[PDB]
Design an enzyme around this catalytic site. Sequence first.
Site, mmCIF file in Angstrom:
data_model
loop_
_atom_site.group_PDB
_atom_site.id
_atom_site.type_symbol
_atom_site.label_atom_id
_atom_site.label_comp_id
_atom_site.label_asym_id
_atom_site.label_seq_id
_atom_site.Cartn_x
_atom_site.Cartn_y
_atom_site.Cartn_z
ATOM 1 N NE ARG A 10 -2.122 1.019 3.734
ATOM 2 C CZ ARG A 10 -1.623 1.965 4.532
ATOM 3 N NH1 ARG A 10 -1.625 3.236 4.152
ATOM 4 N NH2 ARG A 10 -1.115 1.638 5.699
ATOM 5 C CG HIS A 12 6.927 1.527 0.069
ATOM 6 N ND1 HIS A 12 7.417 2.807 0.244
ATOM 7 C CD2 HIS A 12 6.921 0.959 1.292
ATOM 8 C CE1 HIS A 12 7.700 2.997 1.519
ATOM 9 N NE2 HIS A 12 7.429 1.887 2.173
ATOM 10 C CE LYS A 41 5.876 6.456 5.760
ATOM 11 N NZ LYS A 41 6.256 5.595 4.590
ATOM 12 N N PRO A 42 6.198 11.988 6.638
ATOM 13 C CG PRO A 42 7.761 12.324 8.343
ATOM 14 C CD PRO A 42 6.601 11.460 7.948
ATOM 15 C CB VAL A 43 10.373 10.546 3.819
ATOM 16 C CG1 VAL A 43 11.165 10.097 2.599
ATOM 17 C CG2 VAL A 43 10.979 11.799 4.447
ATOM 18 N N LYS A 66 20.019 0.112 7.214
ATOM 19 C CA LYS A 66 20.504 1.296 7.918
ATOM 20 C C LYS A 66 20.599 1.023 9.415
ATOM 21 C CG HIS A 119 12.018 -1.160 6.201
ATOM 22 N ND1 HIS A 119 11.643 0.094 6.627
ATOM 23 C CD2 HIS A 119 13.368 -1.126 6.081
ATOM 24 C CE1 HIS A 119 12.707 0.863 6.730
ATOM 25 N NE2 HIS A 119 13.770 0.147 6.400
ATOM 26 C CG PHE A 120 11.532 1.771 0.199
ATOM 27 C CD1 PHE A 120 12.423 2.832 0.262
ATOM 28 C CD2 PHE A 120 11.329 1.146 -1.023
ATOM 29 C CE1 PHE A 120 13.064 3.277 -0.878
ATOM 30 C CE2 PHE A 120 11.964 1.586 -2.148
ATOM 31 C CZ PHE A 120 12.828 2.664 -2.075
HETATM 32 C C1 T3P Z 1 15.026 7.179 3.286
HETATM 33 C C2 T3P Z 1 13.651 6.677 2.936
HETATM 34 C C3 T3P Z 1 12.803 6.216 3.879
HETATM 35 N N1 T3P Z 1 11.561 5.793 3.518
HETATM 36 C C4 T3P Z 1 10.704 5.236 4.510
HETATM 37 C C5 T3P Z 1 10.704 3.782 4.952
HETATM 38 C C6 T3P Z 1 9.681 3.820 6.033
HETATM 39 O O1 T3P Z 1 8.463 3.205 5.974
HETATM 40 P P1 T3P Z 1 8.339 1.657 5.979
HETATM 41 O O2 T3P Z 1 9.222 1.026 7.013
HETATM 42 O O3 T3P Z 1 6.884 1.334 6.400
HETATM 43 O O4 T3P Z 1 8.650 1.052 4.638
HETATM 44 C C7 T3P Z 1 10.035 5.124 6.731
HETATM 45 C C8 T3P Z 1 10.292 5.264 8.191
HETATM 46 O O5 T3P Z 1 9.426 4.593 9.034
HETATM 47 O O6 T3P Z 1 10.437 6.065 5.687
HETATM 48 C C9 T3P Z 1 11.113 5.787 2.184
HETATM 49 O O7 T3P Z 1 9.996 5.322 1.916
HETATM 50 N N2 T3P Z 1 11.993 6.259 1.211
HETATM 51 C C10 T3P Z 1 13.205 6.683 1.549
HETATM 52 O O8 T3P Z 1 14.092 7.151 0.609
#
Ligand code: T3P
Length: 124
Positions: A10, A12, A41-43, A66, A119-120
């Site tokens: 959802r 990505h 959501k910031p990013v 990371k 996770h991305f």
């Molecule tokens: C650095 C970076 C982080 N993120 C994400 C991964 C995360 O969500 P998620 O873990 O649900 O895939 C998140 C921090 O929680 O920000 C991106 O989607 N693109 C990016 O380039």
Amino acid sequence: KETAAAKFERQHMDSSTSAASSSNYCNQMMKSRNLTKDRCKPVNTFVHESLADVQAVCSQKNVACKNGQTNCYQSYSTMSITDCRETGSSKYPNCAYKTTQANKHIIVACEGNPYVPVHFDASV
Ligand SMILES: Cc1cn([C@H]2C[C@H](OP(=O)(O)O)[C@@H](CO)O2)c(=O)[nH]c1=O
């Protein structure tokens, strides 16, 4: 309620377009995928490849995440992605995003059976 694999899809996956063609892409997508419902959501990165091609990254180059975990995988080839990042002026509920389209390798964490992305981590 949502499984980790479903949440990854959802947040990505956007295989319906080959690339962001509009500065408003992130504003539209962040809202439609319900990533602005309770906060901005910031990013967030969207990947414009088939779900199969992204799932296949879990069998490609094994690298550290990371956070030091070792269940991350970097794609052998570049992929079409769109980075969405809140702008300095954005404030909930009026979330505002900058759209940046690029072609780069993706790094995802994989887990489970089937072993799929959950996770991305980054793009390079
Ligand atoms: C650095 C970076 C982080 N993120 C994400 C991964 C995360 O969500 P998620 O873990 O649900 O895939 C998140 C921090 O929680 O920000 C991106 O989607 N693109 C990016 O380039």
